Design a protein around this nucleic acid. Structure first.
Ligand SMILES: [Mg+2]
Ligand SMILES: [Mg+2]
Ligand SMILES: [Mg+2]
Ligand SMILES: [Mg+2]
Length: 1408
RNA sequence: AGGGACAGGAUGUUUCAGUUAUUCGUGAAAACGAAUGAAGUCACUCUUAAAGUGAGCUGAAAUCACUAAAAAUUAAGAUUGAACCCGGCUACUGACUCUGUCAUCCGGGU
DNA sequence: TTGGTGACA
DNA sequence: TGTCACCA
């Protein structure tokens, strides 16, 4: 009947405490504890940044390919002959390295003319005393652009000497110049020369510079002369090439988006239509209107699109900035009472209700604006109906009735309503006023319709209660509906409807202050702009979030915002408001209630920022809300409900989706494990919590680059959060000034914190009366031994305590004083208990000791009790929606089969409340449930947090009634009861991405690592009978072959031949790369003859892999120190092992890669000869910081200046032999259609399992490649064909006999070279095998990393060769407890594990 | 500021090819320039003048596969998201033009 | 992190 | 066949 889920969201770790029970709170069993170890972005990718970067790399490559296709098509159409390879190469050279179109600016100057160089001398060394900075900067714009030594030195000194400003403070205080101008100059002046870095060295050039370069060097290219002659001029060909180079990927795509375009057909009309469509796509700047007109008149009016390209100027066709503002606009979240669902539920009856209620005089004036606001579509369903032109449900009359009905339902309790929300409530008591409401309702609406009307009204208010809680998705049968349509962006027509919400004006038709002026020219312009400048140019003081006033609503320090900013604002505020004071009066609300200097004013992001995106809701919703909140009319209805917007952080949405899926999956397994088969309504209530630690830990997982700064600011936020200590200024300070309030005295430094209204009496009240600050008290434990959970009156307090606190011991006098003092402070002031003065705060606290008939007693209790129902955050709302949807999806079959009904409810628990008020109590009771001070809470402590969330929700009244766990039992017995409920085991869930072996769209996974590896075959040198494999005849360059005849007999058909060119010279045989790769692919992809197998084997003997690595690799960037020759010239990077057997000529040895000579002459360069030492021990403490720049200067050189369109060189490299991992060759085609082979490395698993024969014998040696790699263009390096009639999967677990009964060992193949081992054993036995302590299992990490000594101890003490050792000591825990389950990947497989799993597999296989 | 998306830029890695220079100013050659579309330099092994090999340089091409005209394809998968194309202005949204066209929009499809 | 590959003995 | 290092 009752299913409960307590979840603590903490980012990486999400604790869970779940139970499904029939009678109240569960037994000791039926309760389960889980922690989700959510993998980081590397193990499970949530962010799309890498995917998007790969997509745009692909799109840039495709843009170039399609531009080259179109250029060849057009040049061959005009040429009327096929382009030769030389002409194609020249054209592609013209097309390569087209310039950029963004991130460039010329200059500006506003403040440099008004500063003195005599005071800038502290940062500028060479400018004279009386010089002006503007002229010097104008000279520098040319000096540094010419890379003049003096100008660059001056700017470098300007940047280097301005690191401190202590002297400049005295300078400005000695002459009293305006610091704002000099600060502006320094903040627009002290920028690094990006315009030089990414112009001269990095090769970034603007599109206009690219066009000028190609115009310069098209004549000089002799390959283009036939094409220039065909185009009848260099200028025309330049215009053609530049116009084609300006096309985006989408234009070329549109041209080539046709199956017949694979023939490269030149279509005149298609190209014209594409070019017209291409440049009509752009939103041009207002300045470029004439350029847009020129381009569109050229293309649209083109009688010959090729001649238009030849004549239209390329500089005009450079596309403007990508105005992607309309990409996926926001959807309005407003909830609307729907005539569609009202007609689905009921017939014409509901419109009859609306008409009957409209006939009543009390409905006078409710439909004033429905003649005008109904014209604007407000929902998605109405949009669909109007698009179809077949309005049925949303006919204007039905919509009028829906709006009127919603206004009647959303009527405020004071606005002449029928006391709805009271006739509906189950607590409706027989009263005269409820009659004076219901009789009016039945007089107006009628007598027959009233039952159905009130059922509808109850359903409506239940739905809006869910909606305002952020849980509108729980209803499962909505009667309102979301808008789901885009609102317009903030244009003037919309600001007309948004100005009134701030100025509190009843209505506004024209922007007369802007259209026609009132108080001269500056009625608004520059006058409110002074206020805007004050808002924006004070940096972090005024408009910045994380301010004290706005981040936590502490209202500044005390008042430090007023006397520093608003005193300056006051004059402008008066001047602006004098205009509206003539046209509007209000009850002083236009400037003292609605408009404020800060906080609720929000003028910064509504009125003072034009457009700036989309408005929140559609204009229909805005008009409805403005009418309901009638301002001058003192409101008429409650504002429209809205659904919770999805989280803006997409990676957060993915993380929450995965967490919700995992938790809903485990809850589905838990409910499906039950034997329920009746019509029972199973209510699933979820309890959730989180805090700033959630954001701090989700800065991780995402692995955000800002994680340093995010944690830097969240650490300050967390310090502020923890600063709320001593229960908000309590203990020995507030309630008592010392000693104890009940007898006691001589308290000392230690006491205890106790309540005034304990659990038993508090359970009769709602909300936070049980735990509020005004309820808690500090007392001696012996003093609190009496009246443990009973009412505490004034007389129970010690007389001396009242004499110290209030000055007299008379209870009557003190209660009269409390009644006097508490009445002076308003409700909203006493609720904010921290803002109170200590006398007032103690009066509020003591108000609880008064009897029930007291006014202060009842007022304080009915304030602190019904304080709030904590709304879920947007992130929490998203997680809740995802979990509820996925659980209700995964259990649909089970609920259908067993006729179960999953009712859902949800409540939030404050993280600070549970951690401070239940976690510490459970630390008292157990001492293993205490919160550590490790600066990061451990894994099982999140399951502890979830259990404490359940415990806290037990004491919340409404939750307890809806949870089935309501009881008035005292604290002691309750804490001794719920402590019995916490299980001794914690299951750890570590979500994983789908293995590429199991996912059908393998393209969603990165198949190959970026970076291509060079593939080489060792040359074969023959000089008579003397045959060597290698490069030279030196013993270090080649190895000898005992019998060359066998090697050549094998490789007859695969060797090229270089003849002697002399009589005593040798012959060089090189493997033909094309035939070698074809043969290796054939032996990988199909069964081949033994000749081909031998040929592939010998080819792989001759095969070696190299890859160029930058010459800067001789420098260690982290240590800022050069590496030694022992590290640079390590033999592992240069030696090739030759192991030709007796079958293949018996050549055995090692060959040094001849790139080692290049590396040697690199480390022996005269500039680097002394900076690089010879041995590791010789590399002492000396460090050189500018080594990388030195190497760049080594290899950078100036060219002959042949071509303006030449690529710059930035990386110089030499080959080395790298460490490889699952090499794969990819067969592709060059631009001429010739097959090219390039070697990559697999990014993921290579083998799908192991082959098992018809007798169940697992082949542990043969690698069974996955089927996605068995393509006609893919060749797995060293791969052989293998047929698997049946095979064992890598994820196939079987328990291993292992010859023991105290342990349970399971293993699976897991990985080709390493098995996975899962061990279930006692925690004490694990701590005996390993030198691992970690205290209790509640402090254990999910990822245990044994030290090398601990690894050796585990291996030795296990006495189990079939366990191996964990790889790098990493152990992943699956369950925590007295019995421990964990799994690990073995460091290396051994035959005992293989034999044991073979026996386990045979046990199942022979069973069949 | 977060996220997503568009537009890409530039350098890399690999494959292929060329290259290990030739003519003129002027011819002493001091003396290096120019041009040949660009590049044209070093190292080792060979033993006769040519070479083999490796590197550098220059140019282009390729730079996940199925897979190819375009698209999707480097996220996730229990589900989805995003992208792109086609049709439409009956209509939510954006741009503009003399306001009806075009879209990032809507509806479908992959 | 992890699936692979080399060298060593 | 295990062992130890290394790669992105
Ligand atoms: Mg892609
Ligand atoms: Mg390769
Ligand atoms: Mg390279
Ligand atoms: Mg279209």
């Amino acid at each position: 009947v009752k299913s409960t889920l307590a979840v603590d969201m903490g980012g990486r770790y999400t604790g869970i405490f779940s139970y499904t029970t029939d009678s109240g709170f569960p037994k000791a069993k039926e309760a389960r504890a889980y922690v989700l170890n959510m993998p980081d972005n590397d193990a499970l990718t949530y962010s799309m940044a890498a995917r998007t970067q790969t997509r745009h790399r692909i799109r840039s490559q495709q843009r170039f390919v399609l531009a080259r296709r179109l250029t060849y098509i057009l040049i061959e159409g005009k040429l009327k002959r096929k382009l030769s390879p030389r002409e194609k190469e020249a054209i592609s050279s013209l097309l390569r390295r087209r310039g950029y179109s963004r991130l460039e600016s010329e200059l500006d100057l506003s403040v440099l003319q008004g500063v003195e160089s005599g005071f800038f001398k502290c940062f500028l060394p060479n400018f004279d005393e009386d010089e002006n900075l503007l002229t010097q900067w104008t000279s520098l714009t040319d000096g540094y652009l010419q890379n003049n030594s003096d100008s660059r030195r001056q700017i470098q000194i300007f940047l280097e000497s301005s690191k401190d400003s202590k002297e400049f403070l005295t300078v400005v205080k000695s002459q009293h110049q305006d610091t704002k101008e000099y600060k502006n100059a320094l903040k627009v002046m002290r920028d690094d020369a990006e315009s030089m870095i990414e112009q001269s060295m990095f090769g970034h050039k603007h599109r206009r510079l690219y066009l000028e370069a190609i115009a310069q060097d098209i004549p000089r290219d002799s390959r283009l002369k036939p094409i220039i002659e065909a185009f009848s001029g260099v200028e025309k060909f330049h215009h053609f090439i530049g116009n084609l180079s300006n096309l985006q990927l989408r234009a070329l795509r549109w041209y080539f988006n046709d199956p017949s375009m694979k023939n490269n057909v030149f279509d005149k009309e298609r190209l014209k239509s594409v070019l017209v469509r291409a440049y009509q796509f752009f939103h041009y700047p207002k300045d470029l209107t004439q350029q847009r007109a020129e381009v569109l008149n050229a293309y649209e009016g083109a009688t010959d699109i090729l001649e238009t390209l030849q004549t239209l100027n390329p500089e005009l066709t450079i596309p403007p900035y990508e105005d992607q503002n309309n990409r996926r606009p926001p959807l309005d979240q407003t909830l609307w009472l729907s005539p569609r669902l009202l007609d689905q539920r009921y017939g014409d009856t509901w419109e009859i209700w609306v008409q009957n209620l409209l006939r009543s005089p009390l409905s006078k004036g409710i439909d004033e604006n429905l003649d005008t606001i109904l014209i604007t579509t407000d929902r998605k369903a109405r949009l669909l109906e109007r698009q179809s032109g077949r309005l049925i449900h949303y006919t204007s009359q039905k919509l009028y009735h829906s709006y009127v009905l919603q206004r009647l339902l959303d009527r405020t309790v004071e606005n002449d309503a029928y006391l709805l929300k009271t006739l509906v409530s189950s607590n409706r008591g027989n009263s005269n006023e409820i009659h004076q409401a219901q009789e009016r309702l039945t007089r107006d609406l009628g007598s027959q319709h009233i039952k159905k009307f009130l059922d509808f009204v109850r359903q409506y208010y239940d739905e809006v209660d869910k909606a305002k809680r952020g849980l509108w998705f729980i209803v499962e049968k909505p009667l309102m509906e979301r808008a789901d349509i885009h609102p317009p962006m903030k244009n003037d027509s919309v600001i007309l409807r948004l100005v009134g919400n701030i100025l509190c004006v009843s209505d506004l038709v024209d922007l007369s202050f802007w259209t026609r002026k009132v108080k001269g020219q500056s009625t608004v312009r520059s006058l409110c702009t002074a206020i805007e400048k004050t808002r924006k140019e004070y940096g972090n003081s005024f408009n910045y979030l994380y301010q004290r006033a706005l981040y936590l609503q502490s209202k500044g320090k005390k008042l430090s915002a007023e006397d520093k900013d608003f005193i300056k604002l006051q004059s402008n505020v008066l001047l602006v408001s004098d205009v509206i004071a003539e046209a509007l009066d209000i009850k002083e609300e236009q400037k003292k209630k609605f408009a404020n200097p800060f906080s609720l004013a929000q003028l910064y992001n509504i009125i003072e920022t034009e457009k700036s995106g989309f408005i929140s809701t559609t204009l229909a919703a805005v008009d409805e809300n403005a009418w309901r909140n009638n301002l001058q009319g003192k409101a008429r209805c409650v504002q429209l409900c809205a659904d919770t917007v999805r989280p803006f952080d997409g990676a957060l949405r993915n993380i929450l989706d995965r967490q919700a899926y995992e938790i809903a999956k485990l809850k589905a397994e838990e409910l499906l494990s039950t034997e329920l088969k009746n019509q029972t309504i199973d209510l699933v209530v979820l309890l959730e919590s989180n805090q700033f630690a959630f954001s701090a830990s989700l800065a991780e997982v995402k692995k955000s680059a800002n994680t340093a700064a995010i944690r830097q600011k969240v650490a300050k936020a967390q310090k502020r959060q923890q600063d709320r200590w001593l229960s908000k200024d309590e203990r020995i300070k507030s309630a008592s000034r010392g000693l104890c309030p009940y007898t006691g005295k001589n308290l000392g430094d230690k006491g205890e914190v106790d309540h005034i209204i304990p659990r038993s009496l508090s359970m009769n009240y709602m909300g936070s009366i049980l735990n509020s600050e005004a309820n808690l008290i500090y007392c001696s434990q012996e003093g609190a031994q009496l009246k443990l959970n009973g009412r505490k009156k004034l007389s129970d307090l010690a007389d001396n305590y009242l004499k110290v606190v209030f000055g007299t011991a008379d209870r009557g006098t003190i209660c009269k004083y409390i009644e006097k003092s508490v009445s002076e402070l308003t409700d909203a002031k006493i609720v904010q208990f921290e803002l109170l003065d200590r006398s007032q705060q103690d009066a509020v606290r003591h108000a609880l000791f008064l009897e029930d008939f007291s006014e202060a007693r009842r007022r304080i209790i009915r304030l602190l009790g019904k304080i709030n129902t904590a709304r879920v955050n947007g992130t929490q709302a998203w997680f809740a929606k995802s979990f509820i949807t996925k659980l209700r999806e995964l259990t649909k079959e089970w609920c259908a089969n067993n006729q179960i009904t999953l009712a859902f409810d949800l409540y939030r628990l404050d993280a600070q409340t549970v951690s401070q008020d239940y976690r510490k109590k459970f630390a008292l009771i157990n001492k293993d449930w205490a919160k550590p001070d490790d600066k990061k809470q451990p894994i099982a402590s999140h399951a502890i947090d979830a259990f404490c969330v359940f415990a806290a929700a037990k004491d919340k009244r409404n939750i307890a009634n809806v949870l089935g766990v309501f009881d008035e039992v005292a604290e002691e017995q309750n804490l001794k009861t719920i402590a019995q409920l916490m299980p001794s085991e914690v299951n750890l869930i570590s979500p994983k991405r789908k293995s590429i072996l199991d996912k059908n769209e393998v393209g969603s996974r990165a198949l190959m690592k970026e970076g291509i590896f060079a593939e080489h075959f060792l040359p074969i040198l023959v000089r008579g009978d003397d045959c060597r494999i290698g490069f030279d005849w030196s013993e270090s360059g080649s190895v000898k072959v005992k019998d060359a005849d066998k090697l050549f007999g094998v490789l007859d058909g695969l060797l090229k031949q270089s003849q002697k060119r002399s009589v005593n010279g040798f012959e060089t045989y090189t493997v033909d790369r094309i035939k070698a790769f074809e043969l290796l692919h054939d032996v990988f992809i199909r069964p081949c003859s033994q000749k081909m197998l031998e040929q592939a084997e010998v080819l792989e003997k001759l095969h070696y892999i190299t890859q160029n690595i930058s010459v800067t690799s001789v420098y260690d960037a982290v240590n800022r120190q050069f590496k030694c020759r022992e590290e640079i010239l390590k033999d592992k990077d240069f030696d090739i092992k030759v192991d030709l057997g007796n079958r293949f000529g018996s050549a055995k040895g090692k060959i040094t890669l001849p790139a080692k000579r290049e590396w040697e002459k690199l480390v022996n360069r005269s500039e680097l000869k002394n900076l690089i030492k010879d041995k590791l021990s010789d590399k002492g403490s000396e460090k050189t910081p500018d080594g990388e720049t030195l190497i760049y200067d080594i290899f950078r050189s100036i060219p002959v200046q042949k071509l303006s369109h030449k690529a710059t060189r930035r990386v110089w490299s030499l080959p080395k032999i790298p460490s490889i991992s699952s090499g794969v060759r990819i067969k592709r085609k060059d631009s001429n259609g010739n097959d090219i082979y390039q070697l990559y490395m697999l990014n993921d698993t290579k083998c799908k399992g192991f082959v098992v024969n018809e007798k169940g014998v697992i082949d542990w040696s043969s690698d069974l490649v996955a089927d996605l790699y068995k393509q006609p263009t893919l060749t797995i390096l060293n791969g052989r064909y293998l047929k698997a009639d049946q095979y064992v999967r890598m994820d196939q677990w079987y328990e291993v006999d292992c010859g023991r009964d105290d342990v349970i060992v399971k293993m699976c193949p897991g990985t080709s070279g390493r098995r996975y081992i899962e061990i279930t054993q006692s925690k004490k036995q694990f701590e005996d095998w390993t030198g691992y302590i970690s205290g209790s299992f509640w402090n254990y990490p999910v990822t245990i990393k044994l030290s090398s000594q601990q690894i050796a101890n585990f291996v030795k003490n296990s006495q189990m060769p079939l366990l191996g050792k964990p790889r790098s000591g990493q152990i992943t825990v699956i369950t925590l407890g007295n019995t421990l389950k964990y799994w690990y990947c073995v460091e290396s497989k051994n035959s005992m594990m293989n034999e044991a799993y073979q026996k386990a597999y045979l046990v199942h296989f022979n069973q069949k």
